[PDB]
Amino acid sequence: TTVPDLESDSFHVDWYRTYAELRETAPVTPVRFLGQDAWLVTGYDEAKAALSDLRLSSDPKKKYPGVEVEFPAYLGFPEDVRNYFATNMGTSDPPTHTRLRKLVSQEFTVRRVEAMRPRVEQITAELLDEVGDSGVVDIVDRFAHPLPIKVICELLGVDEKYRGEFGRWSSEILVMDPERAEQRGQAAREVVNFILDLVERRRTEPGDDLLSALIRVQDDDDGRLSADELTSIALVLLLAGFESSVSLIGIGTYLLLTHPDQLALVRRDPSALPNAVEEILRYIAPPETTTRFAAEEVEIGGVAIPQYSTVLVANGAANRDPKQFPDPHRFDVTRDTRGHLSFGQGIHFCMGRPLAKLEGEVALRALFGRFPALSLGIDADDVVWRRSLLLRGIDHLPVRLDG
Ligand code: HEM
Ligand SMILES: CC[C@H]1OC(=O)[C@H](C)[C@@H](O)[C@H](C)[C@@H](O)[C@@H](C)C[C@@H](C)C(=O)[C@H](C)[C@@H](O)[C@H]1C
């Protein structure tokens, strides 16, 4: 009947209750979003099946006769800008996806990530050193946001004097408001221009960073990254490389601050921190929904998704499907979190998982270790959640350093 409108407050206010009510009626249902028809998948089994079915494409650049492909995430994006944003692993299907991922995997290794551990630890310490010993501060602006941004910049060879602008553009892009479609596309163009200059500088002055290495990566069979591929991969690595981690740190801080019992456990047993981060991701997945396009008719959960349909796989809703995660609304750092979809599923499974876990673990351990009496600076019910189905997070979070 009343087709769900993903722009309504129902999806940004106690929204997991909304996902539950939909999942109960039909884990695969028609919805409206940004002026287009789509299918929302809220069931865990259904979401896993969907992400595993390659008939559900990840490429927004593919053309189909008489069809105008529109991914919600590229709202307001001029075509050329979309291409700059979508010529990488996450926006490619095999065989192209296969070679792009293989080449990037040669340099974006666990070794390279672990080599940054000392840097993550030092940056974390320095940021915490600057907030003081007492009073109220915005833990996002002073910590959760600057840490990942500095880490990804060092990984991608982005000099200090070029880190003060893209954070603002990226922020505008996380929100999908039809009212600001033009501003969103303009923010996107700035990011493109920024990446074009970064690549130019790196080709001219090589270093030991990941971008420099991708400029040189090659393989007898897979070949190498074309100029367009290199540029597009650098772009998403820059944005995806810090935004999801900022969300994790902010959400994790909020969850630990509002679940004293859970925080107590993690502290008593340090070996419990890794799974705590996994549960924080299971509880409130940053990539709440991920988009796919039906290149052919595809049946999911007994529902025939018509060919050329836009499919929104609700990774977050799937993580709260009681059939997969019993007592889903309980944040439990001890639960078996295996199988959650916050890092994806299938061929597009997160390539940054090692780094995301490293940052989350280092950041939360340091923050709560430095401030044993840390407390929320506002009522839990007054925290403002980012209005985005692309990347859920917290943009401002007051905390009292000394309780
Ligand atoms: C807590 C943080 C993170 C979360 C929640 C996360 C989540 C995800 C998810 C859900 C996917 C699959 C998307 C899809 O199926 O279309 C993905 C893909 C990917 N992530 Fe992450 N990610 C995180 C951190 C990172 C970081 C730090 C980087 C980069 C430095 C990164 C790089 C990528 C790349 C390149 C892919 C594309 C894989 C492919 O298409 O083959 N991620 N991530
Ligand atoms: C504006 C649209 C794009 O969004 C972003 O880059 C966001 C800033 C990131 O946080 C997204 C949400 C990532 O965290 C991963 C889930 C997916 C990512 C790796 C992709 O490859 C994917 C194609 C992505 O680039 C687009 C959805």
Tab-separated table of C-alpha atoms and ligand atoms in Angstrom, residues 73-74 88 90-91 173-174 184 236 239-240 244 287 390-391, ligand 2:
chain	number	residue	atom	x	y	z
A	73	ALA	CA	24.529	7.528	-4.752
A	74	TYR	CA	25.420	9.550	-7.857
A	88	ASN	CA	37.172	1.077	-9.869
A	90	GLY	CA	33.425	-1.332	-6.334
A	91	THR	CA	31.909	-0.107	-9.616
A	173	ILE	CA	28.455	13.798	-0.744
A	174	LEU	CA	27.420	11.496	2.116
A	184	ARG	CA	26.400	17.633	-4.321
A	236	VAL	CA	37.511	6.024	-3.961
A	239	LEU	CA	37.041	8.822	0.308
A	240	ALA	CA	36.205	5.238	1.319
A	244	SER	CA	33.748	4.540	7.028
A	287	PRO	CA	27.272	1.200	4.785
A	390	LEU	CA	24.925	5.611	1.935
A	391	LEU	CA	27.083	5.951	5.039
B	2	LIG	C1	29.215	8.571	-3.465
B	2	LIG	C2	29.136	7.094	-3.839
B	2	LIG	C3	30.362	6.243	-3.416
B	2	LIG	O1	30.490	6.379	-1.973
B	2	LIG	C4	31.679	6.474	-1.255
B	2	LIG	O2	32.764	6.432	-1.863
B	2	LIG	C5	31.592	6.631	0.304
B	2	LIG	C6	32.334	7.882	0.753
B	2	LIG	C7	32.147	5.399	1.004
B	2	LIG	O3	32.048	5.593	2.443
B	2	LIG	C8	31.443	4.064	0.566
B	2	LIG	C9	30.016	4.018	1.194
B	2	LIG	C10	32.353	2.841	0.985
B	2	LIG	O4	32.505	2.864	2.432
B	2	LIG	C11	32.085	1.341	0.640
B	2	LIG	C12	30.823	0.736	1.285
B	2	LIG	C13	31.930	1.248	-0.909
B	2	LIG	C14	33.091	1.839	-1.807
B	2	LIG	C15	34.432	1.198	-1.462
B	2	LIG	C16	32.815	1.692	-3.326
B	2	LIG	O5	33.619	1.128	-4.071
B	2	LIG	C17	31.480	2.301	-3.851
B	2	LIG	C18	31.350	2.086	-5.382
B	2	LIG	C19	31.445	3.851	-3.478
B	2	LIG	O6	32.640	4.481	-4.045
B	2	LIG	C20	30.228	4.739	-3.848
B	2	LIG	C21	28.951	4.085	-3.236
